[model samples]
Target: ADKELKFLVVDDFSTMRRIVRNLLKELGFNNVEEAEDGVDALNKLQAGGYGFVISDWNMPNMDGLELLKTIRADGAMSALPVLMVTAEAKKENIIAAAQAGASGYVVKPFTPATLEEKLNKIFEKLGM
Candidate 1:
């Protein structure tokens, strides 16, 4: 993966967003921005230059799953890599996210290594 690739981190809680952003910095990915929800994420994404996304599943206005589907449906950003980082741990939710074109999924309360591993897998799959 390109170290300079821009990432969008979306979560309703400020703490989780900070945690993820810090973790990404620890991983040497410094070009990251924060969004409070899926709608906010979509707005930032539309402005362009976001190569990746890490989003929470449950949020006001729109959820991560809806955002993933919308990104997949959009011609300009259809190939964007979206990794779901949320508390929704049900098998169905996982399946739905995968089917909706999420590049990866990580349950909440995850270790930094888990997030790193999922990100590696997505990058590898996309040949980034």
Candidate 2:
């Protein structure tokens, strides 16, 4: 199941990106790529053939919320599974993300188990 997935991880911090990539690998998801910001994410997304996206909320040139909205609005990529990963854990932010069609949301400083749980939940919901 892991091999069937290709992921795009977006974050401004290279260290965080590396950490996430390693975590995904440990979860058996080996096919993953990194993007520095929302703009970079969109560029890679446009290149096509990605199954999932994990993004940081506070990023330069578009942010996770805007990126999720953009993807939802685009007919071709509207159904792309997006998981917003950020320090934003406020109730309002969670509500907003759900309203914007985010597949999942994870607060920063989370354990690898938390990430894995969120991903599995989304995957099950989408029947992936």
Candidate 3:
């Protein structure tokens, strides 16, 4: 995966957003931005140039799953990589995300190493 890849980090919590941004920076991905919810995420993505999305499942005014669906439905950006990064660790949630076409899934409270591994796996499978 390219370290210069641009990423959109979406979460209602500022703390998680900051954590993800900092982690991406530490991993050498400096081109990152934040969105407070799915609505915010969609707005930013519409501006274009985002290579990947890392989003929290639950949030006010549209959630990650809805965002995933919207992205997949859009013709212009349907191929965008979306990775669910959420506290919802249940098997059902994971299955739903997979069915919705998420590029990858990561449970919350993950270490940097775990994030890297998941991202790499997604990149390999997607041939990114």
Candidate 4:
């Protein structure tokens, strides 16, 4: 894994974003940033240099699914890896995320190990 890869963690909750940031630091990813929602995420992404995204599904201004679709539609960052970590557990939600080009999906209240595993799987699939 490339420890230098920059990561963007998008979540409306400050606590959740902090938790994810801490977990990523534990995994040796120190180059991390935060966004409150999809709109903020898209802005940061457009500014450049983000290598990965971990987003929560529900948020104000813009949701994760919309962010995923936007990323997929953007030519510059269309191939950027996005892993959804959300409380939304509906089968349709999962299918929709996949169809929208999410690199992986993990349910909320997930352990650090699960997050690491999902990220590894995504990186492997993308040959990162």
- TM-score rank, highest first? 4, 3, 1, 2
What candidate 2 gets wrong by more than 4 Å, as runs, is none
lDDT of 2 by residue, 13-89 (tens): 99999999999988989999999999999999998889999999899888989999999999888999999987759
How many steric overlaps are in each model, in order? 0, 0, 0, 0
Clashing pairs in 3: none
Q: TM-score, each model?
A: 0.97, 0.96, 0.97, 0.97
lDDT value, candidate 3, whole model? 0.92
Expressed as tens digits, the lDDT of each residue in 34-78 for candidate 4 is 999999999899889999999999999999999999999999988
Question: How many residue pairs of model 4 clash at the backbone?
Answer: 0
Query: Which digits, one per residue and each the tens of the lDDT, describe model 3 over residues 10-126?
Result: 999999999999988878899999999999999999999999999999989999999999999999879899999878598988999999999989998899999989989989988
Candidates 1 and 4: which is better by lDDT?
4
Output the worst ten-in-a-row residue range by lDDT, candidate 2.
1-10
Total clashes in model 3, counting residue pairs 3 or more apart in sequence or in different chains: 0
Residue 110, candidate 4: alpha-carbon lDDT: 83
Candidate 2: count the clashes.
0
Lowest-sum lDDT 10-residue window in model 1: 85-94
Candidate 4 achieves a global lDDT of: 0.93
